[PDB]
């Protein structure tokens, strides 16, 4: 329902001379743009990545970002000379800029900066601001960055006006891809538990899109409260993988079922019963020597 658009900048500074800035752009869980240090121009990872903008509008926006990339690099290179030797190389900067789109003609725009892995500076209103609990030696660099009224004025515009206008048109351009439904495929496996006489029943469910899914170990109408929902692991084909774990006492496996509910199925949930002939037939297709197991 609510889509967050984020531009992620990864700037690595090894020493006084060596540096590289690489960026990626997302609209929900789908990558829209790619820009490597070795690349002069921004690359599209979707046919609708330009949105509703013109080849002129996009090129003007591009050049702006092209001078920003060379400028930023020297700008923080000079901020390390300012703080020197309070902060020394290697340095890692991370920028997360963008906007979240809410129902109605309304949105919230953000610009968060993390230094050496920790979030320290944000752009808020008309200026750069240090977040609470940020180191005091960041005050002078932020005072110097706030002295630059041209960058401040363009960043104000880029967040307030450009981000909502670009994304409103980005969602319309990529409606078919975002609303695409990919049916999940589930399989069962078992591993030994950390506890003696126990077994860890694993329900692998892969290739589902969109991300929201429901996976549970059942015993009839009883949701097994010991079922552990894993993290969402991505697939290379822009789909998702998730596995639900259940620690059972060896011998209690019979009766259990992995039930998975997804938007793509249309009410027809996948009910995967343990001791079933489909599982017996499946289990035999994936046998091995168990060498180098966990």
């Amino acid at each position: 329902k609510n889509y967050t658009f984020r531009c992620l900048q990864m700037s690595s500074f090894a020493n006084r001379s060596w540096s590289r800035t690489d960026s990626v752009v997302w609209l929900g869980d789908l990558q829209t743009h790619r820009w490597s240090n070795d690349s002069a121009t921004i690359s599209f990872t979707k046919p609708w990545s330009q949105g509703k903008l013109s080849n002129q509008q996009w090129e003007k926006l591009q050049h702006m970002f092209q001078v920003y990339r060379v400028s930023f690099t020297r700008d923080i290179q000079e901020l390390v000379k300012m703080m020197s030797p309070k902060e020394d190389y290697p340095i890692e900067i991370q920028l997360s800029a963008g906007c979240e789109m809410y129902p109605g003609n309304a949105s919230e725009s953000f610009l968060h900066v993390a230094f050496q892995g920790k979030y320290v500076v944000r752009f808020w209103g008309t200026s750069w601001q240090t977040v609470p609990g940020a180191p005091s030696w960041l005050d002078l660099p932020i005072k110097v960055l706030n002295a630059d009224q041209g960058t401040s004025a363009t960043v104000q515009m880029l967040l307030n006006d450009t981000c909502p206008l670009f994304v409103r048109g980005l969602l319309e351009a990529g409606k078919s891809d975002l609303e695409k439904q990919e049916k999940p495929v589930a399989w069962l496996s078992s591993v030994p538990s950390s506890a003696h006489g126990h077994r860890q029943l694993v329900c692998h469910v892969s290739g589902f899109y969109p991300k929201p899914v429901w996976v549970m170990w059942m015993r009839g109408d009883q949701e097994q409260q010991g079922t552990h929902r894993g993290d969402f692991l991505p697939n290379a084909d822009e789909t998702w993988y998730l596995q639900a774990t259940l620690d059972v006492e060896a011998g209690e496996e019979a009766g259990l079922a992995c039930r998975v509910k997804h938007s793509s199925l249309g009410g027809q949930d996948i009910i995967l019963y343990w001791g079933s002939l489909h599982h017996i037939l499946d289990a035999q297709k994936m046998v091995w020597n168990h060498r180098h197991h966990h």
Partner: T-cell receptor
Amino acid sequence: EAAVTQSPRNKVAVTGGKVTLSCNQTNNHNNMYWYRQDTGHGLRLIHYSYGAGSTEKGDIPDGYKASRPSQENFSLILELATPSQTSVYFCASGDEGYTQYFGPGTRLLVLE
Amino acid sequence: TQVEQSPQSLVVRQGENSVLQCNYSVTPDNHLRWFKQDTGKGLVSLTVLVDQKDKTSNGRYSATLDKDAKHSTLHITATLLDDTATYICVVGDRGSALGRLHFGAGTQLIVIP
């Protein structure tokens, strides 16, 4: 209202002798700059500082050393003077802003 | 050369107008400053232009800026004999202390009585 003073106004040196061009500012400006003006060029940046203790290399730093002992003073040291260093040297200072406030200059002649 | 000033030298009759040109390739270009430098003297600022299409005035000194054509022009109307000096064009690449200044070679103005 934002002044920068330099010493000396004129200097003569021997090729291989130490020369120290001094600059002073009482504006409480954090950043200070050392330039040299030559016929056919614009002012070229030799060294610069971001505060007391800091000394960063400029576009043309070979043959020059720099020293910022405090907020007020910034020096340009020529441990081994050469006739190519015969120039007129300008000093500047500034705060977080873009404006640089220039000094009256220093004529340096390096003779054999 | 990132900042070029034309002509190298200009001669004007006392009371006539003088036009000095500045053309640059500095990227980015935050502002353009015009300095007056008397022989053996320091750099005195005359005017600063900051917008894409800017126009400024300091009484007798007027200047333009076209950041698209990356060109500025300085107008000295009704030149006095005391205007005999070098006029230098500077381009700053940031709106703060982080920026570098890119100085022109100057144009020598000679006011003849």
